[PDB]
Structures are given as structure tokens and as C-alpha cells.
């Protein structure tokens, strides 16, 4: 019974309310000088799920990239497909950069010198631009995928997945048959990893207290005015992002905003109270019906959008890589800043899970900037993003079904007018 109602429980809320009682009971036992046995004693259990997030990050990028970008190929595009994958993929790097816009215009992470032991986290060197633009082709995918390196996994899998769907449509029968069974094996790897994924976010609760407190037991590191200014950093910015992007967008292409943003201010009522963008698609659907466009190419378009558009998560990751980046000390570089553009629009193109893709996004941006989730200082720094993640994924949802929402109806317009 007990358990039953533990894990009927939504995952963000749970999460939220360890990271509450994190807060709590590490400034409790941290007042009480009880500072060692908080240590030796609760950072296995929160070093652990950092552990299993590190764990679940690499085979997510390959198998999933590959699905993805074999659902996005020019081989199976028409003449709305290429518009929508341009749209979807212009937006989203549009979104990271307000992201970064707005994360340079406040100062998330300045106030919270963040140090395990006594150490500050000593950052690596970074190469020239023209050495990461080199280096996003890999000289070995199997050596790219032992090691980290989530640009060069990245890569490969967009290839590997628009050379399947190319051999997908060739006039032999043993060849399509063999990338088929090839599709469906990997395919079938990133649907086994989405329920191991499920399984640690489930988890993640006990992980994220077991971090926060010890977090709070070795310093008074004064968090809560900074996650407060993040969430007003990350509501500013989708606001921002919705007002000037979309508002910008439709008045070049000539529709008017207001009725549009009437019917789809009442799409966004409905997908902010059930937090969901999956479970608005009828209910968006019935909004592009009602603005009265094309059935055919709404009902090709929102599924697709639904699951690969994601404009909300992705200015939340510039916005949480840049506090993870200032809560530390380091600073980051014009190339580690298309680093974050790269990895978020490429990362935002095939994964979609219901719970924690979000998590396991930041863990890829992470990975791929340089902060690699294994210094304890990264962990903390992403553990307190992962709590503040609920409140920031009510609004990163509204923004997600606005984007694919305002995508539709901008390219119904050019292709039936």
C-alpha cells in the first residue's frame, strides 16, 4: 500500500519535496555539527543516482538520434515536411540562444561558490573553433562511443540513421529487409532504455535528498534566492521567447496574433494545467481545426511535433547549463556556447520520454560542454536544477505546444494560401 502510493505519486513532485527535505535536514544536521557522519553516510546514496544518470545518457544519444533522424530524412519529406523540420530546427536554436540571452542578462549562478571538500572546480582547456567544427565528425564512432564525446555520437547517429531510411526505399529485397531488422533493433534498444530511464527517475527522489543534504550540511551556501532567481530567469525568458519569437514570426507571414492567440490561449490553458504535451493533442488538434487550415496537414504535423519539437526544454537547458556553468567559477567561451546550441537543437530531434528526458538532455549539454557529472560540484549544481525542474516544467511545456501549435499554423498558411 505504502509503495503502491509512493510510486503512484507524480516523479517532479516527489522530487521537489526531496529536494525540500534535502534543504532541511542538511541545515539541521549541519547546525548541529553532525557534519562528517551526513557525509560518510548519505553521499553514497546521492552519488549513486549520479551514477545511473551517467549511466543512462550514452546508449539514450545513439539509439534514439538514430530513430529520430530516420523519422526526419529528406526521404520521407514532401514539400511540408522540409518547412516543418526548417521551422522546428530554426526555432529551437532560437530558443537556446534566448536561453543564453537570458541567462548572460541575470546571474543565475553568481553567490553559490560551490566546493566538495576545500577544492574549486579547476575547468579544462578549450580548443579553437575550427578544432570543434573538426571535431564533431569522429575519427572512430566506436571510439566515440566507449569514450564520451556526445557531438561525435550525435553525428554518426544522424548519418547512420538517413543511410537506413535512404536503404530503406532500395529496389533489392534482402538489403531492405536487412535495414529494417537493423531499425527495429535499435529501435527496440532506445525503447528498453526509455523504462530503465522511468526506473531511475523513479528513484531520483531519495538520490537528489541524499545530495541536497550533504550539500547543505557542509556550508550555509544561500540557495534559494538563486533557484528563485533561475525559475524568474526561465519564466522571463519563455515569455520573452513566446512574445518576440512567435509575435515576430506571424507578423512577417501576415496572420494575426490576436485571434490566434485566443484560440491558442486556450490551448495553453489546457496544456499548462495537465503539464503535459502529449496529452493536448487532441486538444490541439481541435485548435487547428477550429482555426480551420487543412485536416491532412495538421494530422500530419502535430504528432511531430509533439515529439520533436521542444522549444521550452531547450531554452530551459541553455538556461541550466549557464547556472551549472556560473555556480562554479568557470566561464564559458563563444565555442562552448555553440557547443550548447549544437547539442541542444541535435539532442531536441529524437528524444522524447515522458518523465526525466529533460534530465537526461541537461546530463548530454553537460557532457558535451565539458562539466562531466562526475565531480560532486556538477552533481550539486544539476541536483538543484533537478529539483527546481517541476516548476520549470509546467512552463516549458505551455511553450512546447506553442511552438509546434504556431509551426502549424504558419505553415498551413504559405502552403495552402
Do not use: W
Not at 531547450?314 to 567559477?329: D, E, K, M, P, R
Not at 537526461?360 to 562526475?374: A, F, K, Q, R, Y
Amino acid at each position: 500500500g505504502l509503495y503502491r502510493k509512493y510510486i503512484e505519486y507524480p516523479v517532479l513532485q516527489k522530487i521537489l519535496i526531496g529536494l525540500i527535505l534535502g534543504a532541511i535536514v542538511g541545515l539541521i544536521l549541519g547546525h548541529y555539527g553532525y557534519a562528517h557522519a551526513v557525509h560518510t553516510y548519505v553521499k553514497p546514496f546521492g552519488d549513486l543516482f549520479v551514477r545511473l544518470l551517467c549511466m543512462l545518457v550514452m546508449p539514450i544519444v545513439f539509439a534514439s538520434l538514430v530513430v529520430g533522424a530516420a523519422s526526419i530524412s529528406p526521404a520521407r519529406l514532401g514539400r511540408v515536411g522540409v518547412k516543418i523540420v526548417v521551422y522546428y530546427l530554426l526555432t529551437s536554436a532560437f530558443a537556446v540562444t534566448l536561453g543564453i540571452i537570458m541567462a548572460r542578462l541575470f546571474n543565475p549562478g553568481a553567490g553559490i561558490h560551490l566546493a566538495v571538500g576545500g577544492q574549486q572546480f579547476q575547468p579544462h582547456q578549450a580548443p579553437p573553433l575550427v578544432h570543434i567544427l573538426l571535431d564533431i565528425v569522429p575519427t572512430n564512432p566506436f571510439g566515440a562511443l566507449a569514450n564520451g564525446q556526445v557531438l561525435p555520437t550525435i553525428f554518426f547517429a544522424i548519418i547512420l540513421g538517413i543511410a537506413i531510411t535512404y536503404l530503406m526505399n532500395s529496389e533489392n529485397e534482402k538489403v531492405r529487409k536487412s535495414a529494417e531488422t537493423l531499425l527495429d533493433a535499435i529501435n527496440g534498444l532506445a525503447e528498453a532504455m526509455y523504462k530503465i530511464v522511468n526506473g531511475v527517475m523513479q528513484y531520483a527522489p531519495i538520490g537528489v535528498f541524499a545530495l541536497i543534504a550533504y550539500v547543505m550540511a557542509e556550508q550555509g551556501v544561500h540557495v534559494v534566492g538563486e533557484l528563485a532567481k533561475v525559475t524568474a530567469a526561465v519564466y522571463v525568458g519563455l515569455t520573452l521567447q513566446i512574445l518576440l519569437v512567435y509575435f515576430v514570426l506571424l507578423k512577417i507571414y501576415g496572420i494575426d496574433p490576436i485571434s490566434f492567440i485566443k484560440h491558442a490561449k486556450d490551448a495553453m490553458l489546457t496544456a499548462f494545467v495537465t503539464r503535459s504535451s502529449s496529452g493536448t493533442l487532441p486538444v490541439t488538434m481541435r485548435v487547428a481545426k477550429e482555426m480551420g487550415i487543412s485536416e491532412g496537414i495538421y494530422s500530419f504535423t502535430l504528432p511531430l511535433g509533439a515529439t520533436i519539437n521542444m522549444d521550452g526544454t531547450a531554452l530551459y537547458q541553455g538556461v541550466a547549463t549557464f547556472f551549472i556553468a556560473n555556480a562554479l567559477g568557470s566561464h564559458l567561451t563563444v565555442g562552448q556556447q555553440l557547443t550548447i546550441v549544437l547539442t541542444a537543437v541535435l539532442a531536441s530531434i529524437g528524444t522524447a520520454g515522458v518523465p526525466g528526458a529533460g534530465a537526461i538532455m541537461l546530463c548530454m549539454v553537460l557532457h558535451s560542454v565539458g562539466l562531466p557529472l562526475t565531480d560532486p560540484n556538477v552533481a550539486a549544481a544539476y541536483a538543484m536544477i533537478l529539483g527546481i525542474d517541476a516548476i520549470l516544467d509546467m512552463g516549458r511545456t505551455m511553450v512546447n505546444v506553442t511552438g509546434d501549435l504556431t509551426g502549424t499554423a504558419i505553415v498551413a498558411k504559405t502552403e495552402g494560401t
